[PDB]
Amino acid sequence: MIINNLKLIREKKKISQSELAALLEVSRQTINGIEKNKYNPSLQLALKIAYYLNTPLEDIFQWQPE
């Protein structure tokens, strides 16, 4: 997943990690650190935050072949 740098958008879209976490208000706040770092931003998280993000996943969440 070279592209789909959705993680980067959040900063660009001036929305804090905590804000995304605030949606869940769970340990997510901490693990959100590794989810984007280790993985691509988690899809389960993604759709729930997508609306908060106001940013379509589909545009960035392309297939993105390796």
Side-chain angles (χ1 to χ4, degrees):
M1 301 180 76
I2 176 174
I3 62 175
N4 194 42
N5 49 358
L6 182 269
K7 47 186 142 155
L8 295 177
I9 294 299
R10 289 162 38 253
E11 347 192 315
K12 294 179 181 182
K13 214 170 187 151
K14 46 266 181 180
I15 55 181
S16 324
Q17 331 213 48
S18 36
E19 294 173 17
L20 278 63
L23 292 170
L24 319 187
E25 291 180 7
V26 276
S27 331
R28 190 66 44 176
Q29 294 173 295
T30 27
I31 59 172
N32 179 276
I34 70 168
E35 290 179 65
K36 52 181 179 290
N37 172 52
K38 293 178 182 292
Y39 312 92
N40 173 104
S42 315
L43 276 288
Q44 295 292 298
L45 277 258
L47 281 172
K48 292 186 94 45
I49 64 177
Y51 283 92
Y52 182 79
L53 269 147
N54 287 128
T55 314
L57 295 177
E58 318 85 77
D59 178 65
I60 56 178
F61 278 83
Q62 301 296 329
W63 206 105
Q64 343 130 32
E66 325 96 297

